[PDB]
A paper describes a structure:
The [name] core complex consists of a main scaffolding subunit called [name], the [name], the DNA-binding protein LIN54, and the smaller subunits [name] and LIN526. Complexes of [name] with the transcription factors B-MYB and FOXM1 activate mitotic genes during cell proliferation. We find that the [name]:B-MYB complex binds and remodels nucleosomes, thereby exposing nucleosomal DNA.
We, therefore, obtained a 3D reconstruction map at 3.5 Å resolution. The excellent quality of the cryo-EM map allowed the ab initio building of an atomic model of a ~70 kDa structure accounting for the WD40 domain-containing [name], the Domain in Rb-related Pathway (DIRP), and tudor domain of [name], the middle domain (MD) and a proline-rich loop (PRL) of [name]. We name this portion of [name] as [name] subcomplex. In our structure, [name] amino-terminal region, including the DIRP and the tudor domain interact extensively with [name] in four different sites around the conserved [name] amino-terminal helix α1, which is a hub of protein-protein interaction in several other [name]-containing complexes. Our structure suggests that [name] has a key role in stabilising the [name] complex and, consistently, [name] reconstituted without [name] can still form but it is less stable as shown by mass photometry. In conclusion, [name] subcomplex is formed at [name] blade 1, and 6 where [name] DIRP and tudor bind, and this assembly is stabilised by [name] middle domain and PRL.
Author numbering:
A (entry chain A): 8 to 412
B (entry chain C): 95 to 286
C (entry chain B): 84 to 87, 91 to 142
The structure:
């Protein structure tokens, strides 16, 4: 009934954002993919051609295809240096690569496509070797890939050739993260209410299927996401539909009872992310449209609260360059960027309508649910966001917002 | 076939796979489809260029390094945080602007016209019997080509008949129709 | 519609026309979508010429 008016308001909002973009962004690229991605992750490696104003970064992409062949995609996005020579008047609607900003040699070009059974729910690379990449399948099992052992162009035989195939679930899920400190430790979260733990650093080269090392049954509702601590190799947290944030410790002989348990939100909780500089802070996003900050030294008091998301939240990512910045996204078409240091500041009386004093920036660049996004770990404050409308945006907010000269 | 034809076959199949996605099609609509009444509001020389050049008429080029875009931005102010309140404000402003426009094609007068868009070349009202491009929504969703048959000036809609058989005659607002034949611009002095 | 050498390849999809001979296998989908919105005309003379006589 209202599908006409909702489409109409989305159209007007996007056109307005396209009109008044140049004030808000130092750089945007709007690139249309072949199939929607439920994942995105900047690869840590960066290469800079000599005498050329653009670097060559790299992103890991999955496809959400109806029935036929899916892929694991590793695209290379060329970003400009600080000596870049480009335009900022509008986007372009004119050049055949993207929605205008940044170097003329800003052009996402696919490099590796790999057979993948079903859609790619989530693909996270393993920090100790960006060659190895894990994937999340809609089926029970969780796959692991190495793209060095695969042809750049997939063979049309359609054989899924994972380096390992990891089992231990009963349904699908979305939570999946490696331990950044200890090589081969992979956590996955699924609908079966269980956190299964794998280790691949100690598997035979002859065994192509690997059982889970351990299974955690703490959650009672559907588990949504799980993440390791970024300084402690043995500590990880998880969130679920049960509105419960639980903190787990590997050393515990009790794998069925968590070390901590917190009723973080009054609704579904979809995401969590540890602060990569303060080992004591973490945040979560939830279906109650609020992003709940937390302090690990006391889990009875919620450190702070963020609002102004109009719909659910499906992702939250701390900045890799500044400890005070994080971003979130959800079913609402907007990606918000928060600033911890601005908490408690007294803004002008009206601007409370735009949002709380710490709401640093809102991204109006996606016409559909933003599936996932990730900060670039090499070039500060450049974010690649994908959405259900077959769009892969990489953008960098305007410089003057984050700098008070 | 041929290696070129097979390759171009692969491009065609890529595009077909892309367009079988309703959300991707909707995005294709939002990105490039502008009604004749929307084009003057955005696609002309936008307000960024006007304010930039009025603040620095001594600035030579409109394209240069991001480091000097930092200066050209700071020396304009801090852009407002674009939010739901900002979007509803701007949507109300767009309603006012396009109310102004429709007032202009009844051959009448309009706002004081301090806007940086549409100095005089207001898009003309549609003629009866021309081919226009519009978005048809419903049991047959998507963008289609059709012929115009009538005008509804009171509510600013149009009656169209499509060149696709089996679709028939439907009413589509003024701000969802595009005229294929070359764009017509006439000064506001003619509009009143 | 009019199947294609490589002089011109046109496929009719959703009542629109696009000239695929311009695009190699490496091209992204964004220009293809833009062209398919264009209702590809007869000739592709020049791409909105980069030359600008715009003064300071």
């Amino acid at each position: 009934f209202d599908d006409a008016v909702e489409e109409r308001v989305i159209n007007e909002e996007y056109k307005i954002w396209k009109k008044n973009t140049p004030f808000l962004y130092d750089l945007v690229m709007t690139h249309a993919l072949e199939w929607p991605s439920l994942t995105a992750q900047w690869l840590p490696d960066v290469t800079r051609p000599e005498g050329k104003d653009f670097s060559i970064h790299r992103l890991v992409l999955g496809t959400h295809t109806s029935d036929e062949q899916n892929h694991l995609v590793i695209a290379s996005v060329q970003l400009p240096n600080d000596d870049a020579q480009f335009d900022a008047s509008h986007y372009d609607s004119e050049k055949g690569e993207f929605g205008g900003f940044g170097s003329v040699s800003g052009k996402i070009e696919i490099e590796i496509k790999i057979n993948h059974e079903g859609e790619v729910n989530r693909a996270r690379y393993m920090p100790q070797n960006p060659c190895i990449i894990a994937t999340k399948t809609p089926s029970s099992d969780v796959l692991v890939f190495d793209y060095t052992k695969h042809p750049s162009k997939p063979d049309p035989s359609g054989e899924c050739n994972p380096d390992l195939r990891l089992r231990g679930h009963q349904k699908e899920g979305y939570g999946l993260s490696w331990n950044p400190n200890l090589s081969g430790h992979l956590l996955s979260a699924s609908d079966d209410h269980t956190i299964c733990l794998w280790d691949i650093s100690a598997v035979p080269k002859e065994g192509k299927v690997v059982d889970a090392k351990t299974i955690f049954t703490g959650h009672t509702a559907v588990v949504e996401d799980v993440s390791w601590h970024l300084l402690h190799e043995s500590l990880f947290g998880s969130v679920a539909d049960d509105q419960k944030l639980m903190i787990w410790d590997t050393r515990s002989n009790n794998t069925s009872k968590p070390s901590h348990s917190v009723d973080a939100h009054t609704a579904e909780v979809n995401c969590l992310s540890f602060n990569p500089y303060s080992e004591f802070i973490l945040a979560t996003g939830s279906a109650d449209k609020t992003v709940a900050l937390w302090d690990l030294r006391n889990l009875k008091l919620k450190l702070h609260s963020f609002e102004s998301h109009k719909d659910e939240i499906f992702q939250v990512q701390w900045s890799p360059h500044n400890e005070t910045i994080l971003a979130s996204s959800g079913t609402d078409r907007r990606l918000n960027v928060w600033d911890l240091s601005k908490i408690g500041e007294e803004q002008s009386p009206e601007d409370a309508e735009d949002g709380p004093p710490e709401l640093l920036f809102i991204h109006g660049g996606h016409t559909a649910k933003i599936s996932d996004f990730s900060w670039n770990p090499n070039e500060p404050w450049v974010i690649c966001s994908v959405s259900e409308d077959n769009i892969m945006q990489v953008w960098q907010m305007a410089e003057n917002i984050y700098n008070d000269e | 076939s041929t290696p070129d034809k097979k390759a171009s076959q692969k491009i065609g199949f890529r595009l077909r796979n892309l367009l079988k996605l309703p959300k991707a099609h909707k995005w294709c609509i939002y990105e490039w489809f502008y009604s004749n009444i929307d084009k003057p509001l955005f696609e002309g020389d936008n307000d960024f260029c006007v304010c930039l050049k009025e603040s620095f008429p001594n600035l030579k080029t409109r394209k240069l390094t991001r480091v000097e875009w930092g200066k050209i931005r700071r020396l304009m102010g801090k852009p407002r945080r674009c939010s739901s309140a900002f979007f509803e404000e701007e949507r109300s402003a767009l309603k006012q602007k396009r109310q102004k426009i429709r007032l202009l094609q009844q051959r009448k007068v309009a706002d004081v016209s301090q806007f940086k868009d549409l100095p005089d070349e207001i898009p003309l009202p549609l003629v009866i019997g021309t081919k226009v491009t519009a978005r048809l929504r419903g049991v047959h969703d998507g963008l289609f080509t059709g012929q115009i048959d009538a005008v509804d000036t009171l509510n600013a809609t149009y009656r169209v008949t499509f060149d696709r058989t089996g679709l028939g005659t439907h009413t589509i607002p003024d701000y969802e129709v595009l005229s294929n034949e070359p764009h017509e611009t006439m000064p506001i002095a003619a509009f009143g | 519609l009019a199947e294609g050498r490589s002089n011109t390849y046109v496929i009719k999809l959703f009542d629109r026309s696009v000239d695929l001979a311009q695009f190699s296998e490496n091209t992204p989908l964004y220009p293809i979508c833009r062209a398919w919105m264009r209702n590809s005309p007869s000739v592709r003379e020049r791409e909105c010429s980069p030359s600008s006589p715009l003064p300071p």
